[PDB]
Write a protein that binds this ligand. Structure first.
Ligand code: 49O
Ligand code: 49O
Ligand code: MG
Ligand code: MG
Lengths: 546, 546
C-alpha cells in the first residue's frame, strides 16, 4: 500500500535542528525562555521568516529583520540583549553544526532500495552568506539519494500551507494514502494527516524508525552495514583527452579539491572504482577514474609496444598536461599499481602522492631476464599463457559474461587458480559454463563490464603483459633512485597472485612507505572490501596528500 | 635556411639561472669565490651532479651528496661553512626564484609562428622535493609552447656530451646547419658549433635576441604585444554531463583550483572563451567552458520552453551536482550573462562569485509586459525579428560562413546594425555576400564556428530569445531579493546593443557590485579585447573568489 516516503531536512535528515539553536542560545545566554523563537516567528504568515522560507528575500536580507524582531521581543519582555548578541553568529554556528543523521539517511536509502519513491520536503531559504558553501555541500550530499527535493524557497510555498502538500502529492504521482511523511514539527504533519497520509512525529530517530518499520513492513533498524554509494555510469561526467594522434583517454570525473587519478588493473575499467569514486569526492578530492589505454572508451591500438610502461607513463603525463594539472595523486591496483610506482620513479614532479592496492614495488633485477624471473614463480604461470598473441584473446572473448563472472570472485568462491594455466591449456578449462554470481557483483554490474569489452576485446589489455623485456630495460634505468614522495602500499590478505609477502622489502626503495592491510580480501580489492579501501585511502589522502 | 630553434631552460627561457645562486650565495655568505660551484661540479662526468642530470639519482638523493662535496671543498680551502648552511634551503629558494623570461618565450613563440620547429634542450633533474610542484608548474607553462622538450634526466645524456646533440638533431629531423641553438654556457655551445649549428651565447636577453633576429631575419625585438595563448580544440579535455534524459551538456576543461564556469552568448560556443581558457587556468583556476544548451556538442531539443531561464538554470545546477561541485564561479557574456545573474538570484548557495561581460542585471518590470519593454528600444528590434520560429533560422543557416563573418566584427568594421531589422526583412539584408574577415578572427576560427553550427543550426540558440514572458514571470519572483554575493560587471564602450549606460542602476540590486570597463571594445568582448578581459577577470577572481 505505502509506496512513497517523505522526509524533512531540519530535525529529521540533519541534526541538530536549527530551531534548536534558538532554544539553546536562550539557555546559554540566560534570555527569557522562547524569546528567540518569538522573534523568529514574529508576524507569522506575513513575518520576515515566512518571506524568507518563501524565497522572497535571501538569508542575508533576513538577518537584520530578525535582529529588529529580537530587539522588539526583548523590549516588550522588558529585558536587554547581551553586548555583541549576533544573529549572524548564532545562525552561522547552528548551520555548520547540523550534520546528516546517518540512520535516517540509511533508512531512506533502504526504502528507496525496496522501490519507494523518496523525497525531501523542506522549509528552507536562499542562502547568500559568505559561509553558504557549507550548506551547499550538505544538500549535495543529501539530494543525490532521493527522487525529489522540494524546497519551500524554490516553490514559493511553505509547510504547513496546504498547497505544498498538494504540490508534494503531485510531484510524487501518488495518492495520500500511499505516503509516509516524517517531521519533527507537529503542526507540519497535520495537513498531511488531513489528506490521510501516514505521518511520523520524529522526536528521537530510533523511535521514528520503529514506527517507520512497523508501518512499511521493511527492516530499517539494526540492518546490516550497507555498501558505500556506487556510481551509475550515465550520471557521471565523462571526460576525453587526446594524448597523441591515435590515442584518446577516457575518464570519469567527480568532486573538487586535489586531483586523484585512479588507475585500474587487468582486465577491468574505471567502473572498478565505483565504490571509491563518491567516497573520495565526498572526502574533498577531485577524482579522475581512468579507462586505462586498452579499455572501455579509451583507445586500443593493436601494437604491443603501444603498451610498454614507458609509453603508458609518458601518455599519463601528457594527460595531465592537456588537463592543465601540474600533479595528481596516483592510485593504482594490479597493472595500474605497477604503473603508478613507475610514475613515481620517472615523474615525481607530477605525482603529489602515490598509492598501490595489491601490486608491490619490486625493482627490476639487472642480472635476470624477466622471463626467467617469471618462470620461477608457479603462480605467475598465467603470464606465460598471455604471451602468445591470440591465444588468451580467443579464450577471454569467447564468452564475456562467463569471463567476468569467473574472474570477479571473492576469496571464498574461486573457480580458477592461476596455477599451471599453460599446462591446462587455458584460464577456464576447469571452470563452469555458467558460473554463479559472486557476492561482490550484481548481474547488472557484470553486464556493464561485458559491454565495455565488446568495444575492444582483450588485445590491448593483454598487451600490457607483453612488454616484459622492454619494461625491464626501462626499469633498470631507475635502479639508483628511491621513491621519496608520499607513498602507501595496501596489501590484500587473500590475493594469491599479488601476495602480501611479495611487498616485504619495499622499505628499502621507499624508506617512508606507509601501509594498510585488508584481511579476508581477494585480488579484486575495491569491490571485495570497498568500505575498508575507502577508509584506508581517505585517512592516507588526508594526512599525506592534503 | 634555418628551420629550427633550440633553447635552454636555465638562463635562457627562465631567470635567474640556478648556477647563479651558487655565485650569489658565496657572496652573500662571504665564502671563498667559486666554493659552491666547485662542490656542484666535483668529480665532473662521474660526480654526483652528472648522475643527477642523467636521471640516475633524484634531487633529494643528490642533496646530501652536494653537502658532502661542500664540506670537502671547504676543508681543502681551509674554511668553515656557516652554522645552518643548507643546500636544501639554497636550492628551494633558487628554484622558486626562477621565472619565465617572457621576451625569450615571446621570441620562441614568434619563431614557431613563422614555421620554425622549436625545442627546449635542458640539463635538468628528477625533482622529488616537497616543493617540486613549483617546478612542475613552470615546465607545464613552458612545454606547451614548444615542439619538443628534451630533458637530460629523461634521455640519460647531458650537455656537453656529443650524443645529446645527435639525439637533438634526430628529434628535430633537421641537419645541423638548419638549427640555431641558444645557451648561457659556452662549453655547451661548442659541440653544437662543431656540427655547424648557428649558436648564440646568451648573456643578456636583448643582445641574444638581436643576434637571433639577424641570423633568422625575423623581427623578435620590439615586436607589437602578442595575443594571449589560444586553445586548439583537439588538445582540450572534452567533458559531457547528462543533466536529464534528452539533455547532455558539453564543456571543455582546463586547470586546477576553484571551479570557474564560463557561459557564452548568442550565437557562440565554448570556443568564444579560447583566449581566457589558458589565462585563467594559468592564473590558478579550474576552467569549465560550456557549450550552453542549444550549441555545439550540447543537446539542442527543439521545444521553445526547453530554453526558458528557469529550465536553463536548474540544468546548470544539475550539472554541478553531477560533477560533484558544490559551487562554481559563474562568468557570462550576452545571454550567458543574463543566465549567471539569475543563477546568483535563484541559487546563491551554488555560485562562489558571479560576473557578466556586457549584459547588465535589470530586474523584470512587474508593470510592463516584456514585449512592450522590448518595443520601447529601437536597438532591441532585432529581438522581435527572432520571435517567429523559422524566420531567423532560415537567414542564419543559409550561409554559415557569411553569418559569422558578418556577426563577428570589431567596433570599427561593422556591416550590420541592430536597428530596424524587422522593417528591412532581416539581419543581413544590407551586408555583403562575402564579408571581409574581421581582425578579431582568422578564417580557421570562422570555420570552427561554421562546423559547430552544422550539428544543430539556430533553433535552440534562437529559442533563448523566445521565452520573454516566461522569463518575466519567473524573474518577478525575485523582485524582493538583492545580489549580495561577490559580483563584477564589465561594460564594453562600443557595444551598441548592451550599452554601458544600461548597467547604471545595478548598484540598487547589487550594492557591493564591482566594475571593469573596456574602451574601444565592441559586443564580442572576449575576442575583441582578450588581454583586457583576462586582466580584469584574474584581478577580480584573485580578490573576490579566492
Ligand atoms: N586474470 C586474472 C586473475 C584472476 C584471479 C585472480 N587474479 C587475477 N589476476 C588479474 C591480472 N593480474 C594478476 C592477477
Ligand atoms: N545577433 C547579433 C549581434 C550582432 C552584432 C552585435 N550584437 C549582436 N547581438 C548578439 C546577440 N545578443 C545581443 C547582441
Ligand atoms: Mg523541521
Ligand atoms: Mg644553462
Amino acid at each position: 500500500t505505502l509506496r512513497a516516503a517523505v522526509f524533512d531536512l531540519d530535525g529529521v535528515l540533519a541534526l541538530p535542528a536549527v530551531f534548536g539553536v534558538l532554544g539553546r542560545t536562550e539557555e546559554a545566554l540566560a534570555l527569557p525562555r522562547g524569546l528567540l523563537n518569538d522573534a523568529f516567528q514574529k508576524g507569522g504568515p506575513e513575518g520576515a521568516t515566512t518571506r524568507l522560507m518563501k524565497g522572497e528575500i535571501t538569508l542575508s536580507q533576513w538577518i537584520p529583520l530578525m535582529e529588529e524582531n529580537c530587539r522588539k521581543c526583548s523590549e516588550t519582555a522588558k529585558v536587554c540583549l547581551p553586548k555583541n548578541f549576533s544573529i549572524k553568529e548564532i545562525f552561522d554556528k547552528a548551520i555548520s553544526a547540523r550534520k546528516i543523521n546517518r540512520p535516517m539517511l540509511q533508512a531512506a536509502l533502504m526504502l528507496r532500495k525496496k522501490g519507494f519513491t523518496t523525497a525531501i520536503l523542506t522549509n528552507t531559504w536562499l542562502d547568500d552568506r559568505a559561509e553558504r558553501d557549507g550548506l551547499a555541500q550538505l544538500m549535495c550530499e543529501l539530494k543525490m539519494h532521493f527522487d525529489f527535493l522540494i524546497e519551500s524557497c524554490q516553490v514559493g510555498m511553505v509547510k504547513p500551507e496546504p498547497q505544498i502538500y498538494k504540490f508534494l502529492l503531485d510531484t510524487l504521482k501518488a495518492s495520500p494514502s500511499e505516503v509516509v511523511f516524517l517531521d519533527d514539527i507537529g503542526a507540519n504533519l497535520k495537513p498531511a494527516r488531513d489528506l490521510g497520509m501516514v505521518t511520523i512525529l520524529v522526536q528521537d530517530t530510533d523511535t521514528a524508525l520503529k514506527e517507520l518499520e512497523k508501518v512499511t513492513g521493511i527492516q530499517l533498524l539494526n540492518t546490516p552495514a550497507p555498501l558505500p554509494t556506487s556510481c551509475n555510469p550515465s550520471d557521471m561526467s565523462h571526460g576525453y583527452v587526446t594524448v597523441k594522434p591515435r590515442v584518446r583517454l577516457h575518464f570519469v570525473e567527480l568532486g573538487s579539491g586535489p586531483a586523484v587519478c585512479l588507475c585500474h588493473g587487468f582486465p577491468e575499467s574505471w567502473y572498478s572504482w565505483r565504490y571509491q569514486i563518491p567516497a573520495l569526492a565526498q572526502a574533498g578530492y577531485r577524482v579522475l577514474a581512468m579507462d586505462m589505454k586498452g579499455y572501455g572508451e579509451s583507445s586500443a591500438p593493436p601494437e604491443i609496444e603501444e603498451y610498454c610502461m614507458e609509453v603508458l607513463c609518458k601518455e599519463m603525463v601528457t594527460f595531465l598536461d592537456k588537463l592543465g594539472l601540474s600533479q595528481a595523486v596516483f592510485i593504482g591496483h594490479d597493472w595500474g599499481g605497477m604503473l603508478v610506482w613507475y610514475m613515481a620513479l620517472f615523474y615525481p614532479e607530477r605525482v603529489r602522492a602515490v598509492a598501490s592496492l595489491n601490486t608491490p614495488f619490486i625493482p627490476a633485477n639487472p642480472n635476470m631476464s624477466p622471463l626467467e624471473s617469471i618462470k620461477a614463480n608457479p603462480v605467475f604461470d598465467y603470464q606465460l599463457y598471455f604471451q602468445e598473441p591470440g591465444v588468451a584473446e580467443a579464450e577471454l572473448e569467447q564468452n564475456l559474461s562467463r569471463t567476468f563472472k569467473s574472474l570477479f570472485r571473492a576469496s571464498d568462491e574461486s573457480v580458477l587458480s592461476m596455477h599451471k594455466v599453460c599446462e591446462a591449456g587455458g584460464l577456464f578449462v576447469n571452470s563452469p559454463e555458467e558460473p554463479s554470481l559472486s557476492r561482490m557483483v550484481t548481474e547488472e554490474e557484470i553486464q556493464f563490464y561485458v559491454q565495455q569489452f565488446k568495444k575492444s576485446g582483450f588485445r590491448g589489455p593483454l598487451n600490457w603483459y607483453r612488454n616484459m623485456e622492454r619494461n625491464w630495460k626501462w626499469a633498470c634505468k631507475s635502479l639508483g633512485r628511491k621513491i621519496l614522495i608520499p607513498a602507501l602500499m595496501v596489501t590484500a590478505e587473500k590475493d594469491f597472485v599479488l601476495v602480501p609477502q611479495m611487498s616485504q622489502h619495499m622499505e628499502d626503495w621507499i624508506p617512508h612507505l606507509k601501509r594498510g592491510h585488508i584481511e579476508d580480501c581477494g585480488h579484486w580489492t575495491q569491490m571485495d572490501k570497498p568500505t575498508e579501501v575507502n577508509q584506508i585511502l581517505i585517512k592516507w589522502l588526508d594526512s599525506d596528500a592534503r
